[PDB]
Design a protein around this ligand. Sequence first.
Ligand SMILES: O=C(O)c1cc(-c2ccc(F)cc2F)cc(I)c1O
Ligand SMILES: O=C(O)c1cc(-c2ccc(F)cc2F)cc(I)c1O
Lengths: 115, 115, 116, 116
Amino acid sequence: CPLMVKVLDAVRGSPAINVAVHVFRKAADDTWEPFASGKTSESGELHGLTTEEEFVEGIYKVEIDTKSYWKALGISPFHEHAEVVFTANDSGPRRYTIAALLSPYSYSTTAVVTN
Amino acid sequence: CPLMVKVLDAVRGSPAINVAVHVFRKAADDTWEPFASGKTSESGELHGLTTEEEFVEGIYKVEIDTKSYWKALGISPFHEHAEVVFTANDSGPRRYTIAALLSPYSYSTTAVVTN
Amino acid sequence: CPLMVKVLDAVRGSPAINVAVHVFRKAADDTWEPFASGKTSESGELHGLTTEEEFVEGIYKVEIDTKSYWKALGISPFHEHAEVVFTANDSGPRRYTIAALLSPYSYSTTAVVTNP
Amino acid sequence: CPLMVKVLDAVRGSPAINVAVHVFRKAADDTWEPFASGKTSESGELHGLTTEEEFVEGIYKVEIDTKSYWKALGISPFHEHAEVVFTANDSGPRRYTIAALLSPYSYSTTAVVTNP
Ligand SMILES: O=C(O)c1cc(-c2ccc(F)cc2F)cc(I)c1O
Ligand SMILES: O=C(O)c1cc(-c2ccc(F)cc2F)cc(I)c1O
């Protein structure tokens, strides 16, 4: 409930469906440890990645597999994937939404943090 | 239900609340006639602008009063407002979401059309 | 020049070439008066729209004709055009770059404003 | 040059100056090897990172140090950095411009790819 991911398609004007998303947490030795993953729904959303109990302060990476998404549509893309890296802080609001708007040679990403 | 507007703030990482939004429809004589309006909610959303019965094919303009939003926050903005102009077509999906992501000197806008 | 427009294509990863651009200025009577127009070059840039002398204080609208652009590529896009409306030169002369990044159902626009 | 990076500030309406940028290339062993680095100029541009000879086929990562940028302006931003990962030169040499538009809680990036 603390972390949700939403992906939109700027070519078709639609949610980006069945996009793979991987989340990692930074470990003591500076490597990225798998944390959570899933595929976006028909609404372009990925819910249920983690819980309040598990989502402690730390540095997290969200990797969105944009290349496979475009290839499935028959479109040649530029990026291998989209990556969003951020620090989770207990000071700020409690719910994080990471959103990405996708085009073949561009993407935009923003965070909405509420509560 | 056919038309919803969502506004986000890229400086604060939050919904853009209490932003004025005006919708117009293009008339026969080429002028813009008021159609619907409102202010975004605490979630940054504006629901209930129109009905399926009233939202006929035509050219529509959505004007978002970004200047007043930034001025209320004490921030000097570039744009007078953000404007989104589009044709509604019965061919395509039935529900239109117009989203805008706001910064003082930039904005991005996208449309999600579903069903 | 004091006003330049740059347009990029996010589907192709290229400048958006031959895009029509019309500029208007709000008149004393509150109507939009034609001010300048042109088309983007092979670099996606449009220079020479105006001069420091002619580009006085006022509210300006830069209308970028994205629909025509996309239709010629075989795409039926969402927007009729992209419109950028701003006050210019109200604290003295500035140089303005208006940039737009285009996709079929989305666009992003930003401005870079410098002082000579 | 075959690889240029441009960075803009959406809060100020200006080039983003003195932004650190690090480039890496994926090694045969699947690790990220340092490839080039630099900082943006007063124009927000970073030129001279590499040459056509050195910029061979491979997977590259361009890491833009946005957090440090924002903190010096008194803003605590959301992202640690902005990272752009792409395959380059796999159909022969190309010229790449990587552009990034920055806000405290958002960034947009695009690429323009041309053939000389
Ligand atoms: O629900 C959302 O969070 C949402 C977000 C966007 C959006 C995403 C990235 C961006 F740069 C601009 C946007 F409007 C666009 C739409 I349409 C959205 O619905
Ligand atoms: O010269 C440029 O490459 C340039 C690019 C942008 C820009 C950058 C990223 C983006 F997502 C959208 C833009 F318009 C904005 C401006 I103003 C530019 O001048």
